[PDB]
């Protein structure tokens, strides 16, 4: 399914049957992304202030993120505050 990532700072979420993507971002335009069932990707010029995908690998370009930029837990893949460099273009979760 396709879903639009809306910048401006409001925290938004999108889910499908479950895989959920929660984010807040800044940038010039709304971007249409896709969720495949879990892979979340931009078919990105947005600057993410936060990201969390819940039910793993994260990429700045679809180029992996540095290990320090994110954390993989029991049910989620989230940005590491203060280490995440604000660029996210693809998330892959195998559960």
């Amino acid at each position, epitope marked *: 399914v*396709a879903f*639009d990532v*809306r910048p401006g700072g409001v925290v938004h979420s999108f889910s499908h049957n479950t895989c959920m993507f929660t984010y807040a971002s800044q940038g*010039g*335009t*709304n971007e249409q992304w896709q969720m495949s069932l879990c892979t979340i990707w931009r078919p990105s010029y947005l600057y993410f202030t936060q990201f969390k995908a819940e039910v793993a690998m994260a990429y700045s370009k679809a180029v992996p993120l540095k290990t320090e930029e994110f954390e993989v837990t029991k049910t989620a893949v989230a940005h590491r505050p203060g280490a995440f460099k604000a660029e996210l273009s693809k998330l892959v979760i195998v559960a």
Partner: antibody
Amino acid sequence: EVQLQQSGAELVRPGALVKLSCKASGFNIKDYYMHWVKQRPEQGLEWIGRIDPENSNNIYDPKFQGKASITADTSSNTAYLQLSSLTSEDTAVYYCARGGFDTNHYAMDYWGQGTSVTVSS
Amino acid sequence: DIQMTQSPASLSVSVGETVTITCRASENIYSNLAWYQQKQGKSPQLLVYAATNLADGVPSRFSGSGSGTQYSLKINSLQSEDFGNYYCQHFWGTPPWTFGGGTKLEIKR
């Protein structure tokens, strides 16, 4: 009840400008895109552009060549379409319509009643 | 930009028959396709969304099918009130989220 209430018919001279309004009731405009659609007499529907009232992001079909400007006022829960350098090609009915942000919600479920614009001296 | 080609441009079908209207996208639109009905002097009305889902309050005689670039709107057991214009619209990629050229449906009697 969801309603989109558009402003009255306009009679405007060639070269002039109009600002059309679309007042939303029963929902918050920050939760949807507000789209604008043109329909020339005896012609099909043509998507003009949209605004996301939560962040003010607005985009258009390039064919309008910057002649359309879409704005929104969240306090009054109203979206607007401004058309400039009007010609006889701009004589049409203009509709506002709300739409969502994902596959199951993009399609415009609620539409305004339309505003007729006649470009004539 | 993605262009939508709607066919046929016009149809004349009797009450009780089946109507099939097709919409072809210039590239894969991944089922991000809606169908609207419009009557003279009235606003368009959503019939089908995301290629195959019936909108609230739409009669069950309406259905949508398709994937990739090819989509269809079907009207089973056509009723006299089903005359009007029908349009498809896509919601894939960077806007414009363009409409098809339309299909004019006449009731044959």
